[PDB]
Amino acid sequence: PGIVELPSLEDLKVQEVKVSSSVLKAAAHHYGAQCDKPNKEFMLCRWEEKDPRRCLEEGKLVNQCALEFFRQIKRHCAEPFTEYWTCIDYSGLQLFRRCRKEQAQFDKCVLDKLGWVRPDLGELSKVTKVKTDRPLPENPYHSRARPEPNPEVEGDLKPARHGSRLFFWTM
Amino acid sequence: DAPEKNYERTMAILQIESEKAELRLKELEVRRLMRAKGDGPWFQYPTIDKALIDHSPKATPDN
Numbered sequence: 001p002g003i004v005e006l007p008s009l010e011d012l013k014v015q016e017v018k019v020s021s022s023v024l025k026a027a028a029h030h031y032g033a034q035c036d037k038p039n040k041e042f043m044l045c046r047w048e049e050k051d052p053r054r055c056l057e058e059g060k061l062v063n064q065c066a067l068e069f070f071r072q073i074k075r076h077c078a079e080p081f082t083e084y085w086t087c088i089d090y091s092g093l094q095l096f097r098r099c100r101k102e103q104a105q106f107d108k109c110v111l112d113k114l115g116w117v118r119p120d121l122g123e124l125s126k127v128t129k130v131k132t133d134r135p136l137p138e139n140p141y142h143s144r145a146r147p148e149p150n151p152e153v154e155g156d157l158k159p160a161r162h163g164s165r166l167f168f169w170t171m
Numbered sequence: 172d173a174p175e176k177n178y179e180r181t182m183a184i185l186q187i188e189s190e191k192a193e194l195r196l197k198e199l200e201v202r203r204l205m206r207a208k209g210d211g212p213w214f215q216y217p218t219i220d221k222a223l224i225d226h227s228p229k230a231t232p233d234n
């Protein structure tokens with residue numbers, strides 16, 4: 001067949017969000033609140049193109065907007081966030097429910113210094129709409145032309161010409 | 172019976188039987204070509220209904 005095209009290693013260099021999973025899980029509700037638009041443009045491009053090579057730049061925007069999400073935490077509320085993700089980080093299942101007062105301190109300092117409202121129960125699971133400028137893929141599966149169907153039956157049904165025509169049976 | 176009656180009755184019998192014999196040979200040839208090519212209404216062995224395919228957005232994108 002053909003050669004599969006791959007992007008170069010410079011096309012894959014972006015500054016990584018090099019924080020732990022409890023750090024990501026601690027700020028995840030405010031992350032889904034504040035980093036909505038580039039994340040949803042990326043996941044729309046990712047379910048529509050069905051190809052990650054066509055989804056690099058939007059992904060870079062994700063990694064552009066996540067870092068600016070954490071810098072904006074690090075400039076303002078580094079200590080209550082640190083006290084919060086440490087308590088998230090203790091738990092083996094990483095329970096939100098074991099960590100409600102540290103969550104309250106982090107949410108208080110974030111609403112005071114950044115004005116961010118934490119999403120409620122049922123908001124980040126909504127199907128939202130995304131206004132992009134990229135065109136709709138007319139053939140995301142790269143499917144070739146389908147075979148033409150067999151001709152259907154038409155014409156009025158006539159009797160059998162002289163019956164069964166089986167050796168001597170005249171009907 | 173008159174010789175006219177037997178004669179013309181014989182011609183009608185011969186018309187019916189010649190038409191039936193030509194139609195039997197055409198039936199053989201039609202079945203041969205429809206088994207060879209599969210483009211007629213016979214020998215249409217079933218395939219999978221494509222209405223069974225779930226075209227919803229799935230859990231992972233790459234599919």
Ligand SMILES: CCCCCCCCCCCCCCCCCC(=O)OC[C@H](COP(=O)([O-])OC[C@H](O)COP(=O)([O-])OC[C@H](COC(=O)CCCCCCCCCCCCCCCCC)OC(=O)CCCCCCCCCCCCCCCCC)OC(=O)CCCCCCCCCCCCCCCCC
Nearest residue numbers: 162163164165166167168169170171180183184187188191
């Ligand atoms: C206005 C609206 C109302 C109008 C009303 C008008 C009518 C009023 C009267 C009402 C009654 C109508 C009767 C039926 C129509 C006429 C049927 C007919 O004569 O067919 C001729 C038919 C062929 O002749 P034809 O010149 O081509 O057609 C003239 C008509 O146009 C015949 O028409 P066709 O050209 O369209 O024929 C079609 C085709 C013509 O046939 C063909 O093209 C050839 C294929 C025939 C079958 C061959 C099979 C051979 C191997 C098996 C042999 C079995 C053993 C033999 C019998 C042993 C005992 C059972 O038929 C078939 O293929 C079907 C099979 C044969 C059925 C015949 C009727 C049987 C009814 C009574 C059953 C009693 C036993 C009869 C004999 C059974 C064996 C057949 O003759 C035969 O096949 C030979 C058998 C004899 C005919 C049956 C006669 C029926 C009356 C019998 C009374 C006596 C009974 C005694 C006691 C019982 C026996 C022990």
